[PDB]
Design a protein around this ligand. Structure first.
Ligand SMILES: c1ccc(-c2ccccc2)cc1
Ligand SMILES: c1ccc(-c2ccccc2)cc1
Ligand SMILES: c1ccc(-c2ccccc2)cc1
Ligand code: FES
Ligand code: FES
Ligand code: FES
Ligand SMILES: [Fe+3]
Ligand SMILES: [Fe+3]
Ligand SMILES: [Fe+3]
Ligand SMILES: [Zn+2]
Ligand SMILES: [Zn+2]
Ligand SMILES: [Zn+2]
Ligand SMILES: [Zn+2]
Ligand SMILES: [Zn+2]
Ligand SMILES: [Zn+2]
Ligand SMILES: [Zn+2]
Ligand SMILES: [Zn+2]
Ligand SMILES: [Zn+2]
Lengths: 170, 449, 449, 446, 170, 170
């Protein structure tokens, strides 16, 4: 539960800033390689609107989710952008991330619990624009002179996704 | 002419025109049976789900007596929405405005200060929420607004022959898994409808990226090669009431890489299906489907995705994506099929993400006046179709064909032209007169073998 | 029928339908006197505000002689908007396109390059900004478009009896405090209108959290419990031209947690108000009102919030929230009332924030065709109402009732059906025939005490 | 009535009403010649550009033979958009849905699985992309849907007299320079149309900051002062087919701060223009223009900005801003003209940014019912105009006038009333009857 | 007007980040006592569109304002969300803040004048989304170890609020 | 290029934070003097939607561009806002920047290659709101005060600008 030091906070901020640049420039192979561990659990669960008096538990990885991939299945998603002949994405849509509110915590065993807000802006073709807001929850560990995410939970704000798809990495 | 069943063509006004949408809402969505959900979404007594009947919000609830009832999600007092929750368990629904308590069937059970302010003069029986006719078929719960309509059995009709193959199977049957993936797609509701009913033709071109990496059986489709025979590799179907589907042989576990539980399930149950429904329907049981139930429910058996297109005007829809799975399948297998179905045909699906523009572009291109006055072509497989001796309804020779397209827009035209069900029911004998080649499969099967 | 005055029910098409809104704009907003503002908003010569009259942008201005003139905020040259400032002081308004100078009365006084380019041939007399007919009552400035409409006093009519209790009172009267709080709300203009006219029924249910926290006198409403006598606690009124309001006795400074100057002001002024108007209106002077003036002005005397619902189509409005305070009250008391009013019913009000969904959900639920063809009920306290031997118009036994609801939609139906004001004025003697209980209050008063 | 040609006034329903816009689309943009582009945008054979013809998308393509064909950007199969690229080079356009390839002229050249799935039971001649008529005038490419319409040269008509002054000039002519600056402005398409056709009256008022800052000869207009003689400073023109423009004398390079290439080009080419087209058209060649070509194209010769207003309904448009430059000018001059044109009239232009609200406010003020029932006034300098002895069509005294305004809405009214071109072609000898003073220029010159 | 040191800038940045987490998680009581002083003035004045030639003074606390609260009046607002049962917020609106341009300046008596840009994304029900850009001007003091705001002026960009309400803390 | 040190990264962040404040407050003259070099090349290219198989070179400062100014031409743009009587700016329209993903690199000879994401939110009149997202590539240069940008390439996401104009810095 102990917050990280200012010097450690910079490196985690700088890690996400580098990570954002690789997403926008389209360097997913190079991201999957450095900044992602082989025991990754990329998870974006489906939160349904319930009453507050409803006593059911929050969605688990076993339940329905937009993303629920391991490294191998996450790699399969990455190769579609590279090797694929996707007609929607010639040319690639311009995406731009806005990471903010980054707060790291020491989780023991050289692992860091990180919470942050993410505002994704997407533009494609002539006049099409879509905006998404997410709440990221990560577990980063120190691997060499850098970081690698092994647990990643993305909480979408909107119930109904006002967009053609959610095919973008965070 | 909006639709031409003889020449197999439709005007571009069908996707764009707002007055045509007015006719669709009146003579299709307020007439035919629409997919509400499944009994697995509301398993225990008291369980409910809010859902759409087109643009009408409705609350499907599992009753205390055991039945399934549905009603319009709107209070009889000032019109306010009664329940906003997607799902849960409730013996009574309370409105957030004043507190009018509604029953499990939408009946006005109680109102605050009834003796004080109303003086018990409020006729609560006349202030019930607009109830909707609910009927179940193999667990799948449908909804209808027209009392003069036929039964859900008759509405499916000869399509029950096919549905029984998978929705009953080896005694287990199938069920939907939630919560669904809701998302807005700026397109007409018929473009995904016609796509998922019989568009094997776009699979090779549009999804050439995903099919190449996955490999297996469906990798050969990528690039639209002319060498592979599609007539022998699949078939297509269409029925009286606009229900139809394409089928690819021996590709049930096609897109699934992790298919061990799903593949073993088919190999264990195919023997029972061959006994129950014969070897003709076992062929389908082992194959990949692309079905649409008229008007706005679609699903892919094998890939196991289940979609419902809720129209929100002529140029927009809300796509609800469930995951259809067998009941008798293991909990681990159900979870495996769910992950693979969402990874392929979810909001961020590896395939579904390719179709995004294909649906929207076809609709919003008709913003131009000269464009929307033009027409669309659906003549792929004209002449090579007719009544099969074994299979009911009309059947096409290949899954890459537009027999389902023609049959969809033919029943659409009939519904749009007819003032009531009585006029539709009058054409039970002469519905497939637009399919001229009667002795097609008789000559084809005699030529073969 | 759009409205049924006999059974006290309305169709849901009134909130949704575009053609009904087309009639509303023709037959109500282009006829009835709309609330523009108050003397205090433009106190001195040269002062102006920009406001709306429905979807029309208008410029109210304080003239040199002391009178008030209004005109359409649109240049006669190309249509460009003249003044964009919310308020200020000016002897002329210049259009920013070319520079056409308009006077305080909206007359085209000067044009650049008139002698040179126009050659003095431009008839400036005929190119004045279309003037709006302005009349005032006790400081409150109204606006009208119809030439055949009656005076402002005749339009209020029976309702002035009540208004004089507060808008004159001890002698000071009341005034608005700017600048207003502007905000868009995705709802029909009638839903806030009917709410503030006599929806004491929602106060206990919706604002149970806010009222229970504040405590005091109005804390008993929390939950709408049957134990308390609602009939003795207040009354409800309606009038000929659809003006109506509910009253809660001795609860003027109910929601005010800081009510030192506000209650002391009432305690000092209640004596002279009793001698002027009487003890029947003294009861009102100390009570908490919830009024709506037809069509689209509303306010809460006591809590001192003042709102105007500017329609932006059938499914949207723009709420302009002012604060209504007495003239003779001290500056410190005015500011205290201003803070308590905005904290309760501002943009981020502790009460008004609860109603946000109740307005919008009632409107947008009618997006479905089966839903909007239904009906709305307004029969709470039907029969328990009639002409009072002291109070004018029709009165109800409790403020938690729908006498004002009925009377609002009754006049609404009269305006929508009638082709002109001449057809409206014909019903002056037979407007309250829909309320059948003539001998109600004579039996009530004589039976009591 | 919608338009009053006699008193020179229009209803506010013209910028707002839906049914009027529905009639416009059908009786104008589907009948008239619309500006598609230029030969410079598609220079080599195979080059193409996607563009608009109103609310219809179209693909203008340079054929291998040399001619130019255009067709509706929509697949004949399900209606999907064929090409999404702004420009490029392609001998065939493939649809992204099923893979239907179309030729350079929009003909269905080939379809996947035509032997196997279709069995060659598909009339591909009839299933070609909806072709559009394409004619060019001095490089400038136009497009038309109506086959019963006249030629492009006759549609321009007497306006050709003026166009030849600059679009041919010394010999080279002019050409567009892309890529264009696309931007959505929430206003009616006519409001910019009427602005660029002859609204010199707004320039001194609206752009008082830009003119005073830049200074020079155009700085005197800022503030709208009566002392300066506007009759001597410029003239205004209008033709039979709705075309019209204003002109400021010797103001061509007025807005340009850096103008060594553009000014010296005019100084070297003015002598050739004087010999060919005479001194009457030499006056125009040196002056700053202010034109709109009916319906919905416009430009400013001098500042060298070129705009096309693509309507997206009655209350919205998409402004494509090209840069019109001379052919025979040097590469350095072409780039210099481009930077100055965009700095003044680009998306973030020093002048164009001021007009933003003037376009939108005129349209969206009619949201009110009482407002839209009012009328607009275009009567600045009525009577002070007529047929000029030398110049064809109708001419006004000053550039600060509404002669082009009256002429714009006059032909607009005619197109809206006429069911076919035969009704419009009937009134070729009686179009300028609304202008009463025939012997105006005969007496003025004497 | 002396800008604060980099070490102090992080502490103020980390304070606003921890403050944002409490609004998003709905921990208003801990925020009200831990991050707000008892002499707090929460203020959001109503600016109106005036002409440049207008010489009237800018809105003061005496004039109209959406927020104009003391500590007790803020506690009145906080306890409504906490203990009360608002139907509009059952369930509860998803909110997310994006703080930017955190520029702090030193004031007298160990106080800190802090300017900040705020973008608030609110989601609720199925498809309802609203955005609010806002400018924040605060005076913070050092409650060891630890900051606590005692003046807070919120400046809304849009004149007409395109939302049902503005019931959210900043 | 090597990434900059934490201390240098802070000064560049603080430089941009101050720069944003000058745009919002409307201090364009003080900006041009302090924060802009005299050999500045303010550039915003018009990017085109082209197919992936098309191998034409990227836009250059002598192709079409929205901005393509030197220091003298930037003064012209700044002086319009100050001395000019623009009517669209009575009253002046509100703007609010949200700079994120700031990453600096040592170019050489006391110069810094800086990449960053910018989200501009503009508000004017009653209900008019427009949003713009763009990537900024800068070459900063050190001097007595702090920094001065001498190359500034702004990259718009949307092809068609959904706004009346793009008349705003960065
Ligand atoms: C319509 C929708 C999906 C498919 C399909 C996609 C991948 C693999 C097998 C079938 C065919 C038609
Ligand atoms: C309609 C609107 C508001 C109220 C009301 C709310 C709080 C306290 C007193 C009255 C009653 C009816
Ligand atoms: C209409 C539009 C622009 C101009 C114009 C602006 C600046 C310099 C020269 C002409 C005149 C009328
Ligand atoms: S609206 Fe449902 S209770 Fe009044
Ligand atoms: S539009 Fe107002 S003066 Fe021309
Ligand atoms: S839609 Fe273009 S190929 Fe079928
Ligand atoms: Fe597909
Ligand atoms: Fe309320
Ligand atoms: Fe201009
Ligand atoms: Zn890293
Ligand atoms: Zn996990
Ligand atoms: Zn989203
Ligand atoms: Zn802290
Ligand atoms: Zn203060
Ligand atoms: Zn806001
Ligand atoms: Zn600096
Ligand atoms: Zn450069
Ligand atoms: Zn943009």
């Amino acid at each position: 539960q102990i917050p990280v030091t200012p010097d450690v906070h910079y490196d985690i901020e700088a890690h996400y800033r580098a990570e954002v640049r690789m997403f926008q420039t389209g360097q997913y192979r190079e991201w999957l390689q450095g900044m992602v561990a082989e025991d990754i659990h990329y998870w974006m669960p489906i939160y349904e609107q319930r009453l507050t008096r409803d006593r059911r538990p929050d969605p688990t990885p076993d339940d329905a989710a937009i993303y629920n991939d391991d490294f191998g299945e996450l790699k399969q998603r990455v190769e579609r952008l590279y090797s694929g002949q996707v007609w929607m994405e010639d040319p690639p849509s311009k995406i731009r991330y806005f990471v903010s509110n980054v707060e790291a915590f020491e989780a023991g065993n050289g692992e860091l619990d990180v919470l942050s807000n993410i505002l994704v802006y997407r533009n494609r073709r002539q006049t099409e624009v879509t905006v998404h807001t997410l709440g990221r929850e990560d577990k980063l560990r120190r691997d060499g002179n850098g970081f690698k995410v092994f647990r990643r939970k993305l909480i979408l704000d909107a119930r109904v996704t006002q967009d053609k798809n959610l095919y973008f990495f965070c | 002419t909006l639709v031409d069943t003889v020449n197999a063509s439709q005007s571009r006004q069908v996707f764009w025109d707002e007055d045509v949408y007015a006719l669709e809402i009146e003579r299709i969505f307020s007439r035919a049976w629409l997919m509400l959900g499944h009994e697995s979404l509301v398993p225990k007594p008291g369980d409910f789900i809010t859902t759409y009947m087109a643009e009408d919000k409705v609350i499907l609830s599992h009753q205390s007596d055991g039945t399934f009832r549905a009603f319009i999600n709107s209070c009889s007092h000032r019109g306010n929405q009664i329940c906003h929750a997607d799902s849960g368990n409730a013996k009574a629904f309370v409105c957030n405005y004043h507190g009018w308590v509604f029953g499990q069937d939408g009946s006005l059970v109680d109102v605050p200060l009834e003796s004080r302010c109303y003086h018990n003069s409020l006729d609560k029986q006349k202030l019930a929420a607009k109830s909707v006719r609910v009927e179940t078929y193999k667990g799948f719960i449908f909804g209808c607004h027209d009392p003069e309509a036929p039964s859900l059995e008759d509405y499916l009709g000869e399509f029950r022959y096919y549905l029984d193959t998978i929705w009953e199977g080896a005694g287990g049957g199938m069920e939907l898994l939630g919560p669904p993936m809701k998302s807005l797609l700026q397109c007409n509701w018929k473009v995904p409808a016609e796509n998922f009913i019989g568009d094997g033709y776009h699979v090779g071109w549009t999804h050439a990226a995903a099919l190449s990496q996955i490999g297996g059986e469906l990798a050969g489709l990528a690039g639209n090669r002319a060498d592979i025979p599609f007539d022998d590799l699949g078939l297509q179907f269409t029925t009286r009431h606009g229900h139809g589907f394409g089928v690819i042989d021996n590709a049930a576990a096609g897109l699934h890489i992790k298919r061990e539980g799903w593949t073993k399930f088919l190999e264990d149950t195919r023997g029972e299906v061959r006994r129950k429904f014969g070897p003709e329907r076992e062929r389908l049981y082992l194959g990949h489907w692309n079905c649409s139930i008229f008007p706005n429910c679609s699903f892919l058996y094998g890939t196991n995705t289940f979609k419902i297109w809720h129209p929100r005007g002529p140029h927009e829809i809300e796509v609800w994506t469930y995951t259809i799975v067998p009941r008798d399948a293991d909990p681990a297998t159900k979870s495996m099929i769910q992950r693979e179905a969402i990874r392929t045909f979810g909001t961020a699906g590896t395939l579904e993400s390719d179709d995004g523009e294909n649906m929207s572009s076809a609709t919003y291109i008709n913003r131009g006046v000269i464009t929307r006055n033009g027409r669309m072509n659906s003549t792929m497989g004209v002449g090579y179709e007719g009544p099969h001796p074994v299979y009911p309804g009309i059947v096409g020779i290949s899954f890459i064909g537009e027999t389902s397209y023609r049959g969809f827009y033919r029943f659409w035209k009939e519904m749009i032209d007819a003032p009531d069900w009585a006029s539709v029911k009058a054409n039970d004998d002469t519905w497939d007169s637009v399919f001229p080649n009667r002795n097609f499969w008789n000559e084809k099967l005699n030529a073969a073998e």
